[PDB]
Structure 1
Amino acid sequence: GVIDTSAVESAITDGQGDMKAIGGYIVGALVILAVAGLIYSMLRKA
């Protein structure tokens, strides 16, 4: 019921927190990747 469903809101809140964080750090890797492929393209090219 109602109140208990307030706590649902809470844990779901943390959960959303984490998700956006980790999803964040993966993005870190992707950036390093993406960018390393930009350098690889620089060699290919020139």
Structure 2
Amino acid sequence: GVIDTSAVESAITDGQGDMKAIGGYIVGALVILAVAGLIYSMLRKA
């Protein structure tokens, strides 16, 4: 009496493979305010 849920794992494993894609696109934008955070500290201490 089953219902075919084969279209579930095919849909959301491709879903969770897309959460990883837009996680790496944020990490690449948070290191901008990490690098610029501490080369401001070099100019101030000088």
Task: Tell me if both proteins adopt one fold, taking TM over 0.5 as the criterion.
Answer: yes
Structure 2 residues not aligned, in runs of 5+: none
Q: Which has the larger radius of gyration?
A: 2
Normalising by structure 2, we get a TM-score of 0.72
What is the aligned-residue identity percentage? Answer: 100
Aligned residue pairs: how many? 46
Q: 1:37 to 1:9 in 2, by over 3 A?
A: same
More helix by share: 1
4+ residue segments displaced more than 6 Å? none
Normalising by structure 1, we get a TM-score of 0.72
